[PDB]
Amino acid sequence: MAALEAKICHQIEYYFGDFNLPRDKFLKEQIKLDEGWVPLEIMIKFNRLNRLTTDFNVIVEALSKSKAELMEISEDKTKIRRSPSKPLPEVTDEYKNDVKNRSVYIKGFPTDATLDDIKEWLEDKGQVLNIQMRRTLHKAFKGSIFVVFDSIESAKKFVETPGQKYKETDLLILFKDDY
């Protein structure tokens, strides 16, 4: 259960996180409806969470044990929200350049690779805050992605690592800027 709970925590914390939330039109709209609270009945409509479970009890139990302490759970346990004490970061020019400086472009993945395959591949490449799978105008995966690491250090070590491959396939790795 712990493994599944960890997956649930990470997926929900990603939705309400610093990277996704500011760009999530639908979620931002929901957060305006009831002081940040979003019914779990709405949360289970989120594709990736839905695949893990739709059981409100399992979702709540999971979040209750999170270390991130990012989410709050309602008294009746049917709604969740990002803690109002954890406001979203000010998006200054410095903040954006900081983000850009730890973002990396990676080309070489097979077009049938899933977000899960890539997340698994990156597990031992450093803490990542976002994986942006680039797609064509017909929504097909291009084989290239943008990855936002936790620190410039993590990004640089990854980039400076020679001969990296996604199971046999040589990859082209460049800092977002260089791309």
Tab-separated table of C-alpha atoms in Angstrom:
chain	number	residue	atom	x	y	z
A	1	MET	CA	0.000	0.000	0.000
A	2	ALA	CA	2.885	2.367	0.794
A	3	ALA	CA	4.186	2.216	-2.784
A	4	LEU	CA	0.762	3.024	-4.224
A	5	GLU	CA	0.298	5.760	-1.621
A	6	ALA	CA	3.636	7.294	-2.539
A	7	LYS	CA	2.580	7.352	-6.193
A	8	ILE	CA	-0.710	9.023	-5.270
A	9	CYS	CA	1.059	11.669	-3.152
A	10	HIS	CA	3.582	12.485	-5.869
A	11	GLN	CA	0.940	12.690	-8.579
A	12	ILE	CA	-1.357	14.998	-6.617
A	13	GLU	CA	1.535	17.072	-5.303
A	14	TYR	CA	2.633	17.474	-8.913
A	15	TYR	CA	-0.812	18.784	-9.925
A	16	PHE	CA	-0.835	21.392	-7.155
A	17	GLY	CA	2.913	22.013	-7.400
A	18	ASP	CA	4.885	25.153	-8.231
A	19	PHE	CA	5.473	24.072	-11.816
A	20	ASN	CA	2.126	22.740	-12.961
A	21	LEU	CA	-0.376	24.790	-10.972
A	22	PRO	CA	0.544	28.172	-12.521
A	23	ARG	CA	-0.040	26.653	-15.977
A	24	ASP	CA	-3.080	24.496	-15.188
A	25	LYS	CA	-6.130	26.351	-16.503
A	26	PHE	CA	-8.691	23.806	-15.321
A	27	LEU	CA	-7.170	23.365	-11.859
A	28	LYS	CA	-6.673	27.096	-11.313
A	29	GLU	CA	-10.355	27.553	-12.106
A	30	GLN	CA	-11.327	24.875	-9.576
A	31	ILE	CA	-9.226	26.469	-6.827
A	32	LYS	CA	-11.285	29.650	-7.237
A	33	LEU	CA	-14.617	27.942	-6.528
A	34	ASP	CA	-14.254	27.081	-2.841
A	35	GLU	CA	-11.261	28.723	-1.122
A	36	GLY	CA	-8.822	26.338	-2.811
A	37	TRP	CA	-10.759	23.182	-1.908
A	38	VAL	CA	-11.294	20.731	-4.763
A	39	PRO	CA	-13.673	17.775	-4.349
A	40	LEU	CA	-12.039	14.365	-4.703
A	41	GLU	CA	-14.926	13.616	-7.077
A	42	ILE	CA	-13.245	16.122	-9.396
A	43	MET	CA	-9.697	14.954	-8.642
A	44	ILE	CA	-10.430	11.380	-9.709
A	45	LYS	CA	-11.264	12.745	-13.158
A	46	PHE	CA	-7.554	13.572	-13.509
A	47	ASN	CA	-6.294	10.844	-15.840
A	48	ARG	CA	-3.065	9.750	-14.091
A	49	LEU	CA	-4.574	9.753	-10.601
A	50	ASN	CA	-7.648	7.893	-11.845
A	51	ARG	CA	-5.385	5.053	-13.043
A	52	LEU	CA	-3.917	4.707	-9.539
A	53	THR	CA	-7.252	4.681	-7.714
A	54	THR	CA	-10.634	6.404	-7.465
A	55	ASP	CA	-11.083	5.403	-3.795
A	56	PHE	CA	-11.368	8.610	-1.732
A	57	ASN	CA	-10.241	6.714	1.404
A	58	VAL	CA	-7.023	5.533	-0.250
A	59	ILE	CA	-6.256	9.014	-1.606
A	60	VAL	CA	-6.795	10.650	1.799
A	61	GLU	CA	-4.816	8.030	3.702
A	62	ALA	CA	-1.974	8.556	1.237
A	63	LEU	CA	-1.913	12.342	1.523
A	64	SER	CA	-2.180	12.072	5.314
A	65	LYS	CA	1.249	10.437	5.377
A	66	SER	CA	2.957	12.764	2.902
A	67	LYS	CA	6.238	14.369	3.954
A	68	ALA	CA	5.771	17.256	1.532
A	69	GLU	CA	2.953	18.604	3.697
A	70	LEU	CA	1.777	20.512	0.629
A	71	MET	CA	-1.880	19.445	0.680
A	72	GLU	CA	-4.597	19.934	3.300
A	73	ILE	CA	-7.494	17.485	3.704
A	74	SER	CA	-10.984	18.722	4.588
A	75	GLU	CA	-12.644	17.756	7.866
A	76	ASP	CA	-15.112	15.466	6.068
A	77	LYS	CA	-12.236	14.117	3.962
A	78	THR	CA	-14.015	14.609	0.633
A	79	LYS	CA	-11.969	17.627	-0.494
A	80	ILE	CA	-8.303	18.657	-0.723
A	81	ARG	CA	-6.368	21.855	-1.333
A	82	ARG	CA	-2.888	23.292	-1.505
A	83	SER	CA	-2.034	24.681	1.934
A	84	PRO	CA	-2.820	28.419	2.003
A	85	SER	CA	0.385	28.721	4.055
A	86	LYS	CA	2.347	27.483	1.049
A	87	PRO	CA	1.654	30.221	-1.499
A	88	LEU	CA	2.980	29.864	-5.040
A	89	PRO	CA	6.413	31.486	-5.624
A	90	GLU	CA	6.640	34.988	-7.070
A	91	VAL	CA	7.415	34.532	-10.770
A	92	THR	CA	10.163	37.135	-11.103
A	93	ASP	CA	12.643	37.330	-13.972
A	94	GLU	CA	15.203	35.807	-11.599
A	95	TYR	CA	12.844	32.931	-10.835
A	96	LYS	CA	12.300	32.206	-14.529
A	97	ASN	CA	16.007	32.328	-15.415
A	98	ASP	CA	16.673	30.084	-12.446
A	99	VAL	CA	14.163	27.616	-13.888
A	100	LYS	CA	15.630	27.893	-17.394
A	101	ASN	CA	19.153	27.315	-16.037
A	102	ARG	CA	18.174	23.942	-14.572
A	103	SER	CA	16.079	22.789	-17.524
A	104	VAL	CA	17.489	20.283	-19.994
A	105	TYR	CA	16.585	19.246	-23.545
A	106	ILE	CA	16.890	15.546	-24.337
A	107	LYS	CA	16.348	13.977	-27.745
A	108	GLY	CA	16.531	10.286	-28.615
A	109	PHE	CA	13.628	8.494	-26.916
A	110	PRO	CA	11.561	6.111	-29.048
A	111	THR	CA	8.256	7.671	-30.061
A	112	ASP	CA	6.317	5.007	-28.148
A	113	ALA	CA	8.020	5.776	-24.824
A	114	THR	CA	5.562	6.791	-22.105
A	115	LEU	CA	5.872	9.379	-19.364
A	116	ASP	CA	6.255	6.458	-16.969
A	117	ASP	CA	9.135	4.947	-18.965
A	118	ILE	CA	10.980	8.249	-18.916
A	119	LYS	CA	10.279	8.973	-15.238
A	120	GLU	CA	11.694	5.541	-14.439
A	121	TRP	CA	14.759	6.205	-16.599
A	122	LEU	CA	15.389	9.532	-14.835
A	123	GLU	CA	14.997	8.096	-11.323
A	124	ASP	CA	18.771	7.737	-11.059
A	125	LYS	CA	19.600	10.982	-12.893
A	126	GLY	CA	18.629	13.446	-10.168
A	127	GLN	CA	15.501	14.944	-8.616
A	128	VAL	CA	13.200	16.216	-11.357
A	129	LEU	CA	10.306	18.657	-10.953
A	130	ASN	CA	8.851	18.333	-14.454
A	131	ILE	CA	9.128	16.251	-17.610
A	132	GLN	CA	7.663	17.928	-20.664
A	133	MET	CA	7.133	15.420	-23.455
A	134	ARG	CA	7.254	17.404	-26.695
A	135	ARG	CA	4.562	16.522	-29.214
A	136	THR	CA	3.723	17.239	-32.835
A	137	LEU	CA	0.673	19.128	-34.047
A	138	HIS	CA	-1.051	15.737	-34.279
A	139	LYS	CA	-0.187	15.065	-30.617
A	140	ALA	CA	2.399	12.393	-31.367
A	141	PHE	CA	5.423	12.181	-29.069
A	142	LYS	CA	8.444	13.623	-30.897
A	143	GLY	CA	11.069	11.632	-29.027
A	144	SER	CA	12.432	14.749	-27.307
A	145	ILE	CA	11.641	16.242	-23.893
A	146	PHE	CA	12.418	19.121	-21.556
A	147	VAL	CA	13.337	18.208	-17.988
A	148	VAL	CA	13.393	20.609	-15.062
A	149	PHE	CA	15.796	19.426	-12.362
A	150	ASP	CA	15.722	20.499	-8.719
A	151	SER	CA	19.046	22.357	-8.977
A	152	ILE	CA	21.512	23.750	-11.519
A	153	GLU	CA	23.902	21.257	-9.952
A	154	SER	CA	21.632	18.322	-10.778
A	155	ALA	CA	21.107	19.638	-14.303
A	156	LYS	CA	24.810	20.201	-14.959
A	157	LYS	CA	25.916	16.802	-13.661
A	158	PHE	CA	23.313	15.203	-15.921
A	159	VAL	CA	24.335	17.269	-18.944
A	160	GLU	CA	28.069	16.747	-18.376
A	161	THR	CA	27.612	12.972	-18.132
A	162	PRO	CA	28.896	11.519	-21.450
A	163	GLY	CA	27.552	8.534	-23.369
A	164	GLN	CA	24.052	8.644	-21.888
A	165	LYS	CA	21.507	6.347	-23.486
A	166	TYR	CA	17.887	5.324	-23.222
A	167	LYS	CA	18.400	1.575	-23.399
A	168	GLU	CA	20.818	1.313	-26.340
A	169	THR	CA	19.868	4.597	-28.043
A	170	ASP	CA	22.359	7.477	-27.921
A	171	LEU	CA	20.777	10.737	-26.719
A	172	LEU	CA	21.409	14.392	-27.544
A	173	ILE	CA	21.476	16.403	-24.304
A	174	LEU	CA	21.624	20.199	-24.148
A	175	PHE	CA	20.705	22.872	-21.633
A	176	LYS	CA	17.382	24.399	-22.667
A	177	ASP	CA	19.163	27.655	-23.504
A	178	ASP	CA	21.707	25.924	-25.728
A	179	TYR	CA	18.873	24.158	-27.555
